[PDB]
Design a protein around this ligand. Structure first.
Ligand SMILES: Nc1ncnc2c1ncn2[C@@H]1O[C@H](COP(=O)(O)O)[C@@H](O)[C@H]1O
Ligand SMILES: Nc1ncnc2c1ncn2[C@@H]1O[C@H](COP(=O)(O)O)[C@@H](O)[C@H]1O
Lengths: 447, 447
């Protein structure tokens, strides 16, 4: 939700951001908002004018009681004032609802540091890490996407796609999943199940060492926490609702974590509040029904360890920068070459002010694919969930800033490990850092 | 689902099992199904008779063609025949629908060793284990449920309830979960989160060592897998259905595990199929909205590692014994005193033929509570999901038996650990077998 103040004190700033975002059909809203806001104030100033009248008409009927008191009229003038006052109050009431309806439907104001663009093609790579293994046949695409700034090694043989690897590795059964649940669902098997759990613990241990409190939240939440966490467009495209209940399957632990302190006033002496949640994630993925990679890259359910941060507005950006690096550290230990990208205005989303994504190099796919995302939501969720804080128990509480970032979403971490650590025969070596969690050091094909 | 052949050949047998189950109403169904089945079987005969009669009349009306051909009579007949075949055919389909309606709502035939009883009160203790710590104020109930066949020791202090321990230990937030999702939801925090994952991993390893193939299934399934794993009653009381989708949140890994091989003819050579699934579980828990224990003992979501077995009928009973013991073994290492009860007809349920439960002694509560349950479903699920096997491609395929059993449901295992391992000051000592998974050897209080 956007702060009506910000709109009153800079409609042009919002209209232009609305354009950098591509939300052109919504700039007209800026005006609509202000003219309503204006009307709201006018009716309010009339109510005061009227309350004051109520008073004068009052002292009068009295001042006339000690006189001829023909106050029969003033009594009628009084009855209409309360009538008007009510009408106005109700009118003001509705006027606020229309204002808020637009406010809840407006994307966060982007930071000046986010590049301007149309879509994912415009995101801007700002950093690379690792020695990518590239197939002779992807050499150009790689060099273009890496801008030549990344260390690589050419591969003789053609690296396989993760879906095929899971197969030769006996790690999954897609067909039976389709019979039981439908498309984009799956059964994970053997070593892959241990690897999944292992990735959760690894992620979990590290954020804990960095001081984040580990939480397992509710996987189903009430509607207000979903609408307080993202744009309403998500109820159609991504969020599953359960019949006959005010319960929605969470698409990320981010949401229940942000709901965890809805309607509170935190004590500044506690910030930053650091949470690291684990939870299955459920997504309709309606926009597609089958795009390309047909394994566990884009599915209906996946596990994800999430970093969530409550901070003072003055600390958010520094935190945005810390969490993204927390995620980067994991993949480096996991030995996954990648590139972090600054998402542009057109691919940014409604909730974020700025967003960094980690796109891992996928040897088999011949490309970089998103594997984690860190967003600074500033006060957007806060204003919605009413999450404020105060330092001195006598001052006006201010909204806090919220931030979230993937630590590890097992689904993709697994495709990245399978595609980046595969050997010609299909054998997949497990990054040394996970050995303490898996037991085995590699997964060999079955026969 | 019960076999129509069983009802025909042995109606008395099923009536008696029903009476023994005290399903006094359904007993009438046996005769009803029989009555409809005979009509159904007759009309089927009628239809074949008529079809053959129609042909003999088709060749004959054409025979009179080369003769006087006063076929204007046979013609009228051939029309009565097709009219009858049509009428019959519909009566048949209707008959099948009424018959299946009953076949699908009939409980499984209990094994003669299942004791008769009205509810869980009549459930029978068949074995005990461990040394229980008992509060003096709970001595009667303890001896009552222990039959005085279990070693123990009296505590002069009152051991606390897990809900309280969770609070003094800083491992959960219930108030916020209620804000965010409603009651019987929760946020697990700090070392309780690690303990939760550590229990899943511990169960997985032990079951893997025993050769079960580990699996992570779909958390949402199509209605048929649900209708194939339990009685329809469950749709009202337990299973959450997702809006506008033929998808249902699973109440246990057992269901998709059973659905995994629906409509297949396994190769006898592969039997037994041993699966150990992990997954979150969702239950409506309709019969309640408030009962007694207010922690994580009876909630809407919890994690659970489940044992599932696809078996040859002649091996199912030996397996029912091996899996309950696998669970016992886990709780013994976890050092939780307990008793295992053979479940009676009234607390048995629709899909099991026989069932054992492991009830953990709960120091704070002063009683034994169900922590794991194991069943042999024989061919009940198999008949519904159409799961068969054959040893030779020649032979007619026959139904397999299925069995399921808890390994560890983290929720109740955590209450058992908290209550049986607390100390006077409130800290809880984690059993040694888990150290390799939790790191920490115990959880101490906070301010
Ligand atoms: N449909 C999906 N299937 C598997 N993983 C996903 C899916 N959607 C998102 N993810 C993972 O969750 C991360 C964060 O997603 P978001 O919650 O969309 O920022 C993505 O970078 C992926 O690692
Ligand atoms: N609503 C619940 N909340 C927490 N744990 C449960 C719940 N229902 C069942 N359990 C656990 O799951 C085990 C097996 O239950 P069942 O699937 O009903 O055979 C029980 O013995 C408990 O340990």
């Amino acid at each position: 939700m956007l702060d009506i103040k910000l709109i009153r004190e800079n409609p042009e700033l919002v209209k232009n951001d609305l354009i950098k975002r591509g939300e052109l059909e919504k700039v007209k809203w800026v005006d609509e908002i202000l003219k309503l806001d204006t009307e709201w104030r006018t009716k309010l100033k009339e109510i005061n004018r009227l309350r004051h009248e109520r008073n004068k008409i009052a002292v009068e009927i009295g001042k006339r009681r000690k006189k001829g008191e023909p106050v029969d009229e003033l009594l009628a003038k009084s009855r209409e004032i309360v009538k008007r006052i009510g009408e106005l109050e109700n009118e003001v009431e509705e006027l606020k609802k229309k204002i808020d309806y637009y406010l809840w439907r407006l994307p966060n104001i982007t930071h000046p540091s986010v590049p301007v663009g149309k879509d994912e093609n415009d995101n801007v790579p700002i950093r690379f890490w690792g020695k990518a293994r590239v197939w002779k046949g992807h050499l150009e695409r790689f060099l273009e996407q890496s801008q030549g700034k990344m260390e690589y090694e050419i591969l003789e043989w053609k690296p396989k796609l993760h879906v095929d690897l899971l197969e030769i590795l006996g790690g999954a059964d897609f067909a039976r999943a389709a019979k039981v649940s439908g498309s984009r669902f799956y059964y994970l098997l053997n070593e892959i199940v241990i690897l999944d759990l292992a990735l959760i613990r690894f992620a979990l241990d590290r954020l804990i060492e960095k001081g984040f409190t580990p939480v397992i939240p509710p996987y189903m939440v009430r509607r207000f926490v979903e609408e307080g966490s993202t744009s309403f467009e998500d109820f159609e495209d991504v969020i599953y609702k359960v019949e006959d209940e005010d319960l929605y399957l969470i698409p990320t632990a981010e949401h229940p974590l942000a709901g965890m302190h809805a309607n509170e006033i935190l004590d500044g002496k506690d910030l930053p509040l650091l949470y690291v949640g684990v939870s299955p994630c459920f997504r309709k993925e309606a926009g597609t029904a089958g795009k390309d990679t047909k394994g566990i890259f884009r599915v209906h359910q996946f596990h994800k360890v999430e970093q969530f941060v409550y901070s003072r507005p003055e600390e958010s950006w520094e935190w945005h920068e810390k969490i993204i690096r927390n995620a980067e550290e994991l993949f480096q230990e996991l030995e996954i070459p990648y590139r972090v990208v600054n998402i542009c205005t057109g691919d940014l989303g409604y909730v974020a002010a700025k967003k960094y994504d980690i796109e891992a190099w996928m040897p088999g796919q011949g490309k970089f694919r998103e594997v984690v995302s860190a967003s600074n939501c500033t006060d957007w969720q806060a204003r919605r969930l009413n999450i404020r804080f105060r330092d001195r128990t006598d001052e006006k509480p201010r909204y806090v800033h919220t931030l979230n970032s993937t630590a590890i979403a097992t689904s993709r971490a697994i495709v990245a490990i399978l595609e980046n650590h595969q050997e010609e025969d299909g054998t997949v070596r497990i990054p040394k850092v996970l050995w303490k969690y898996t037991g085995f050091k590699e997964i060999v094909p079955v026969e």
